[PDB]
Symmetry: C5
Amino acid sequence: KSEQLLRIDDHDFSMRPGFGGPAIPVGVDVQVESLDSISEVDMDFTMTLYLRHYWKDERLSFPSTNNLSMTFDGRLVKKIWVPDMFFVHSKRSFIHDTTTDNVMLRVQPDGKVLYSLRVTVTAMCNMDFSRFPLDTQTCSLEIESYAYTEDDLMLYWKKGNDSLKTDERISLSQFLIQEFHTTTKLAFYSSTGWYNRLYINFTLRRHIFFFLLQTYFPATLMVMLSWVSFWIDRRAVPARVPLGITTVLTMSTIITGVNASMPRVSYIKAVDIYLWVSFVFVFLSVLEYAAVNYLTTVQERKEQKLRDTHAIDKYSRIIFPAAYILFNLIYWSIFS
Amino acid sequence: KSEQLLRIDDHDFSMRPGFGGPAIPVGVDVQVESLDSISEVDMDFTMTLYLRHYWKDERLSFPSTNNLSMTFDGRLVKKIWVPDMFFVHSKRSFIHDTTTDNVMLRVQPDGKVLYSLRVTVTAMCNMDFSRFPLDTQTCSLEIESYAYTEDDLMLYWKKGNDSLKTDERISLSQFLIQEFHTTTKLAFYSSTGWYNRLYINFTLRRHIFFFLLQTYFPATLMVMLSWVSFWIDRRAVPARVPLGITTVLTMSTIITGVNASMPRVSYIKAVDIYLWVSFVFVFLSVLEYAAVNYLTTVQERKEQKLRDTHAIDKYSRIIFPAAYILFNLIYWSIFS
Amino acid sequence: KSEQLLRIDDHDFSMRPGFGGPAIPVGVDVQVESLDSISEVDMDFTMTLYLRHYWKDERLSFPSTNNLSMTFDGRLVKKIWVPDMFFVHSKRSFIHDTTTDNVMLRVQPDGKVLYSLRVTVTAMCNMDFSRFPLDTQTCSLEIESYAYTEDDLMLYWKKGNDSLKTDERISLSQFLIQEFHTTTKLAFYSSTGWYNRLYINFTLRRHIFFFLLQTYFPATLMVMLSWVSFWIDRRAVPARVPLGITTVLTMSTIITGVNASMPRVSYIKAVDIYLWVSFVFVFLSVLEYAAVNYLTTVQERKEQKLRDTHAIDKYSRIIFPAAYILFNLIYWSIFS
Amino acid sequence: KSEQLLRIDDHDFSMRPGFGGPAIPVGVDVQVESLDSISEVDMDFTMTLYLRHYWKDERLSFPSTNNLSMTFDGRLVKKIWVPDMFFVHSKRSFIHDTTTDNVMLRVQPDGKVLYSLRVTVTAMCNMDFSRFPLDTQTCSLEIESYAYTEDDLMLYWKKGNDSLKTDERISLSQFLIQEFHTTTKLAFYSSTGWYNRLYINFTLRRHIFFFLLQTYFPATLMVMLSWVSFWIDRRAVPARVPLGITTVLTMSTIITGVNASMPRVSYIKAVDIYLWVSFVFVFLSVLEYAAVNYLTTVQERKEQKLRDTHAIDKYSRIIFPAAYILFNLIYWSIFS
Amino acid sequence: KSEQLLRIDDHDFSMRPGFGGPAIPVGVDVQVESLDSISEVDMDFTMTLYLRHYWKDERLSFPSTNNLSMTFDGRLVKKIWVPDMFFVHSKRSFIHDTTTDNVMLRVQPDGKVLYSLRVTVTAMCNMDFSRFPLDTQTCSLEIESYAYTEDDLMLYWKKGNDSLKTDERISLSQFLIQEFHTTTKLAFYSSTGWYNRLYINFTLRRHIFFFLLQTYFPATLMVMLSWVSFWIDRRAVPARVPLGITTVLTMSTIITGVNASMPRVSYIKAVDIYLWVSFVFVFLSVLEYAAVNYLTTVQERKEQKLRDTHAIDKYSRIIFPAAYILFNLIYWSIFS
Ligand SMILES: C=C(C)[C@@H]1[C@H]2OC(=O)[C@@H]1[C@]1(O)C[C@H]3O[C@]34C(=O)O[C@H]2[C@]14C
Ligand SMILES: *[C@@H]1O[C@H](CO)[C@@H](O)[C@H](O)[C@H]1NC(C)=O
Ligand SMILES: *[C@@H]1O[C@H](CO)[C@@H](O)[C@H](O)[C@H]1NC(C)=O
Ligand SMILES: *[C@@H]1O[C@H](CO)[C@@H](O)[C@H](O)[C@H]1NC(C)=O
Ligand SMILES: *[C@@H]1O[C@H](CO)[C@@H](O)[C@H](O)[C@H]1NC(C)=O
Ligand SMILES: *[C@@H]1O[C@H](CO)[C@@H](O)[C@H](O)[C@H]1NC(C)=O
Ligand SMILES: *[C@@H]1O[C@H](CO)[C@@H](O)[C@H](O)[C@H]1NC(C)=O
Ligand SMILES: *[C@@H]1O[C@H](CO)[C@@H](O)[C@H](O)[C@H]1NC(C)=O
Ligand SMILES: *[C@@H]1O[C@H](CO)[C@@H](O)[C@H](O)[C@H]1NC(C)=O
Ligand SMILES: *[C@@H]1O[C@H](CO)[C@@H](O)[C@H](O)[C@H]1NC(C)=O
Ligand SMILES: CCCCCCCCCCCC
Ligand SMILES: CCCCCCCCCCCC
Ligand SMILES: CCCCCCCCCCCC
Ligand SMILES: CCCCCCCCCCCC
Ligand SMILES: CCCCCCCCCCCC
Ligand SMILES: CCCCCCCCCCCC
Ligand SMILES: CCCCCCCCCCCC
Ligand SMILES: CCCCCCCCCC
Ligand SMILES: CCCCCCCCCC
Ligand SMILES: CCCCCCCCCC
Ligand SMILES: CCCCCCCCCC
Ligand SMILES: CCCCCCCCCC
Ligand SMILES: CCCCCCCCCC
Ligand SMILES: CCCCCCCCCC
Ligand SMILES: CCCCCCCCCC
Ligand SMILES: CCCCCC
Ligand SMILES: CCCCCC
Ligand SMILES: CCCCCC
Ligand SMILES: CCCCCC
Ligand SMILES: CCCCCC
Ligand SMILES: CCCCCC
Ligand SMILES: CCCCCC
């Protein structure tokens, strides 16, 4: 029996290697397999990855006539000491087990150990959508030991920045992913002490032109179309009135449709300001003709009692486009 | 073997410490890690936290030549006595188990024990939406012992109000969170007796300006736009009629769009009252013109058979805005 | 050891108390903790409750110098006999297990046993929506023994109608709950025999005024608006035609919006009849003006070749409202 | 101990009864409790039922001084031989386990065994939606042995067609259920051989009148409303043009609303043909007036330069209704 | 006992057959039962299948007086050596277990083993939607050993291209499935070495005519309808203006409805280009009449101060259709 080469019953595996002395170093490597999904309302993401550990334990040394190592499955894990990593700020996770548990142990003759497993994790990520759709988000995944402080276990990336590998075909449906890198930091708990923590960081961006074409284009077109009425003769009331009222109706339907398809985040975003200012411009163009119609009727009644283009139209033809251009300049300077 | 220092087999661990005498006190600490989500249709919320227990048991004392403690994982729990806490009014919960069970036990040489675990819980929260979107909600999470009354187990907060800690970056997408504090209260069950219960309280609020801009602004603009027809000549029937009918259509589409985007709660809310009163104001503007046109036709026929502005318009120009302003004053005094 | 006071190994716990003789009575109490959700499409509801059992077994009697009882957790269950209750007509259920299994056993010195557990269950409920939104539903939850007939186990409510308790703040978001009571009935299975079954009954109702305001009010307003054209001069064709066609469009949008927000039940309901009759009334008013315009053109052309209000308008002004009022009287007498 | 009356340790229970000889017959009965849900997009249904097995095993015979049988729970199943049935073409399934496993074994003194359990299963069902909403679907649930061919195990319905029972109040929200019956068939696997398979068959149908009223009625009404313009004076251009364009808008909104409420099946169905032919009829009536108005203006200009009802209208008044009637006759003869 | 024929206790089954020598060959067969679902936003598919393994082990040889084989269930798997296959790039999977584990082991007298199990797996699939709805996707399912490299275990298809069988009734609701075939390829890991990998490939396509009729047809019809105004007398302002503005409103509603019914993928697709170019064509025809009306009013004012068809309409009648046809030719040459 191979479990008789390792003196399982001659040693107590409830304590760490080197217990009572200096801390034991443990190295970590990670390979990212895929990004499964992202949730904007719940503010989390899901990832599948390979996790590997490296450490040395003299109690597992065995004699050999050559340099062949021995490989074991998940059944041996319960009989020896292994490091207890967990994912910080996660919501749910599990280890894959088809057709059997995806766990491996490899032991060298001199006592070096490799421990590998395949896991799926959902972790939290705070997001800010004030600048939507020109926003940028940064996310991270954190690893830490649950029960051992830095006095007992020393956690580090095995090969520095070379310890992170990502799949060539990783992609998301509605985001672009870039800038994977690794960092470390020390954390404190008043109950127990200081801990090492490892990080995996990346960035997310959207496709700008899609949102431009879907949202900003129709609003600009409707605002420009409402300016046509300033060039129609003022004597055609049944032509001037329906134009303005139907433009207002169209702008309202567009705004409702746009709201129906965005993530349901209930605070003011950058796209909302643009849409509601355009709605005010279309509203003001209808009141402009109401003032012209009233003053023309007043003059005709006074002339009849005694017995060309109105100035408001001429000034509107200049004022409305200039105001819209000035608003656009300020907006795109603020929001880049 | 470390389990031989603690005389596990020399004691019965189905009974509480101090059995037959005074109740054993147990202290509790809580650290809130995140708020995962909140559901308005089912009226519940989800939370992840650390739970910690403190107590003393002389049966676990072991000799030591120094003052170092021993740490064990979840495999020891089944061999000793531990407190049986549960969450009152909860719907589902679980303990995280990747890469192993997130359970820890630490024993001092004099017999003091610390018991810590990491858990996610879903709990019920009754809410009232009569004043939507100006409503305020209060929620709480409750802890109690399942099998021991106040005569056997004494449950209390370990450090008073300092025993509750919350994450620096706790947030929700559609709510504002504030005012965490802890309380205690005694509960009675007729079948077994009196129990101590612990509480964690917090408050929720919405972003008012977003809802103002999305809902109250368009309705007011449409109501004011319907008043333009009072200033247009009564002889232009093909201009006066379409304006009113199209304003009614626009108001109806806005109401349908707003209804589709709110949580599906089937009773009358504050925002419903405002919207349907504005729909009546636009409705009454169409009947006013119907009366003006009918009386004009009757007068003209009477004059021709025998062989200026109508008073209704002059009165309407004043009466409609004053009534709308009075309604707004009453509404905003009642709903603040 | 506490399990040595009870002669576990001296008795056979695969058989019921009193085996071979009269049936053993078992009493039941239920405390309803919350109603979690209800689904109209799948016709089921979810509930959380406490379940308690009472019976006597002399094999569990133990000597004592006093009258104190002993409490055990869920680990003792597998070593003794317990009743096997199950929920009839259920779809899924589970027992809570955080931080440990929510199971309790208390044994009296004379052998009386109390068995308590906390459970969540989803159960079916047939619903009929023919009278929506004026419908009323009755539901029940049923309890029965799986393997013992009435000749072996006798099941009853321990304290009659006082055995059911409900929470003071139990509520549903879209329903009103009323009239909790308990009942019993005998059931027959041809393979095994007769069984006792216990029932918990309750009733559900809706908020009528919300549905009235959301659905019946706008349709009535639009129907009344379509009658305005009967008072407009027939010589204004470009005002009479657009009014009718726009009213038809508005009614269609209202009907589509209402259908989009109701439960997706694919058969005719009370509200559907009302909406489509109002649609026909608005449709018939457009044909009315088509007849008036055609006859007027014929009359003028005949007179010119040969070289007031039309009666149809006068009669329509009376007939249409009378017909609508008659329809309303019949409808609301049938559907209350 | 009842498990010592049956000589458990004196027999090998890894081999079937009668091993080495003729196949052992096993009878099956089924009782259907409910139909839980049905998914048209994923093409599956969910069912809850009781499964009962009958067979004889002489090794389980025990002596008795009377004719009583012994009852056991699910704990005995692991110690004897039982048949290994499974559901063919299923997606997921489970056995209910509250308050304990819903499994029963009843053994006669002479060795006859009854094995009963309560199970929930999700099974696939291929559907064809070409004739929606006038389509009919057929579904089945299949039962087979996993590891034994017909040379070892003979599987059959115990009581012919009387072996299937259904609940008196089984129903679905959007379908009607009918025609339950049972069949059998032999199947071949190249790796192992022949197997017996058992079937449960039923039929599903829709409510026709609901779909008629929601879809076919409004489209026909709009098509008939477009014919009104043929009877209006050709000189009323601002009355003729908006009527046609608004009818087109109403029809388009109706089609979009109807599409939004159906299951998302991406190929041509029967209702799509009707709606899009009606849209073409409304489109063609607008071009008809564009032709009449153009020819009228050409004639007037020619006569003025030189110094009644148009035939197109007269012929359209007859042609359009006749073509629509003919289309309806063909459609309802093809789709019944 | 049957397990005493196989010398279980005489062998170490933690090591592979032939340890220390050449690699052991393992053959694989697959039968596909169904395709359960597909998610375009999350980019995965779900499959149910049978997996079979073939290999030889001398340690399981047993003497026999005939040539009959023995069959075992999943309980024997834990006592012998079996291959550890897993699915590469999978998100979740499980093995069916109703009414017991769907696992079979059959052993020949000479030591040949067949190992069969039934599993459901969800695997990722990168998709590209640039050419939607004329896009084509290719998918694969991958099988590999978790712990043994090519120096220990040789993995191959048992019968080449004949090792894959698919159900005759495999189908999807919204896709067509075709071209199943198998391949192999070697993969390298820097940590451990070289592995064999097996592939199963297939292709997906859509129903083109459905999307043509639902999307491209209404947009083309509305573009053609906007050309009618070029043939109407320029002096009918209340007929020309409403036609254009209502055409714009109709096109906008169509675009919103189509966007609401497509998968939520946030980048530009082929259908989006066609729809927004058609919207521009309708927008430009409204400015065309704005120019004609202004130039006519200027001329009449100049002539009055001093005391037929306008050319723009004549040229528009030719230019607009030619440009649309040219755009269609270029678009359909690019996207096939
Ligand atoms: C249907 C709509 C949008 C309105 C309705 O009334 C309007 O004012 C809008 C208009 O687009 C413009 C005007 O021609 C219209 C008409 O008389 O009825 C209709 C027409 C077409
Ligand atoms: C490799 O194995 C041989 C025994 O064959 C041993 O002598 C040698 O030291 C080993 N080398 C290493 C690097 O372990
Ligand atoms: C890893 O590389 C990144 C590159 O952005 C760098 O920022 C980071 O400091 C590096 N970490 C280490 C440990 O070198
Ligand atoms: C600290 O440990 C020493 C043992 O070296 C012990 O004698 C001493 O009492 C301990 N101090 C306290 C405060 O427990
Ligand atoms: C803790 O502080 C909160 C702060 O509002 C207070 O309400 C509560 O009473 C305090 N509890 C105790 C025990 O002091
Ligand atoms: C109460 O306990 C005493 C022993 O202290 C016993 O003698 C007596 O019978 C008990 N009475 C009851 C009612 O249990
Ligand atoms: C209990 O009270 C309810 C109240 O309506 C009644 O319906 C029921 O029949 C009563 N049962 C008994 C056993 O008294
Ligand atoms: C019934 O039991 C009696 C003894 O109680 C026995 O003699 C008889 O044979 C039995 N009959 C059957 C049909 O089991
Ligand atoms: C078939 O079984 C017989 C035993 O009756 C045996 O002698 C013979 O060798 C077997 N044949 C083969 C091809 O293994
Ligand atoms: C299996 O069949 C496919 C069918 O096209 C073919 O492409 C492939 O080369 C075949 N594989 C082998 C190993 O022949
Ligand atoms: C058509 C409305 C948008 C006008 C501005 C063009 C977009 C410039 C934004 C650049 C983002 C990097
Ligand atoms: C409240 C935080 C800054 C957001 C500013 C919103 C201003 C809305 C203006 C809309 C104009 C119609
Ligand atoms: C836009 C219509 C609302 C005008 C009144 C403003 C609301 C006043 C109360 C706001 C609560 C903070
Ligand atoms: C049912 C609770 C009282 C709420 C009062 C609603 C009154 C709304 C009137 C709307 C008039 C159009
Ligand atoms: C406005 C349409 C409803 C008119 C009838 C009034 C409601 C009567 C039914 C009341 C049911 C409680
Ligand atoms: C199908 C069950 C009887 C329901 C009768 C509904 C009749 C509605 C007629 C609507 C005509 C506009
Ligand atoms: C940005 C990737 C190429 C897509 C170009 C889209 C151009 C659409 C033009 C629409 C004209 C209104
Ligand atoms: C905001 C007030 C709207 C009503 C004003 C109507 C136009 C005024 C013409 C002088
Ligand atoms: C009537 C003079 C030209 C009108 C267009 C002015 C455009 C303003 C852009 C600054
Ligand atoms: C509720 C009134 C519906 C009919 C309106 C008729 C207008 C009256 C003009 C005298
Ligand atoms: C023509 C007099 C001014 C019209 C508007 C009056 C508004 C009064 C608000 C109370
Ligand atoms: C159902 C007939 C629709 C066309 C009739 C148009 C009105 C004719 C009035 C004489
Ligand atoms: C102008 C003659 C009457 C028009 C209605 C005829 C209907 C034709 C259906 C065959
Ligand atoms: C000279 C014709 C003017 C047409 C109206 C222009 C308004 C839109 C400019 C982009
Ligand atoms: C009035 C001149 C003919 C108009 C038809 C032009 C169609 C151009 C398609 C190439
Ligand atoms: C807001 C434009 C109208 C100007 C009134 C003088
Ligand atoms: C009198 C000129 C008014 C201009 C307003 C835009
Ligand atoms: C709604 C105002 C009506 C007044 C008629 C005299
Ligand atoms: C708004 C109605 C006024 C009535 C004046 C005669
Ligand atoms: C409503 C029908 C009126 C008939 C008058 C002659
Ligand atoms: C509808 C076509 C009419 C043809 C008249 C010559
Ligand atoms: C479409 C532009 C034509 C210009 C004719 C002079």
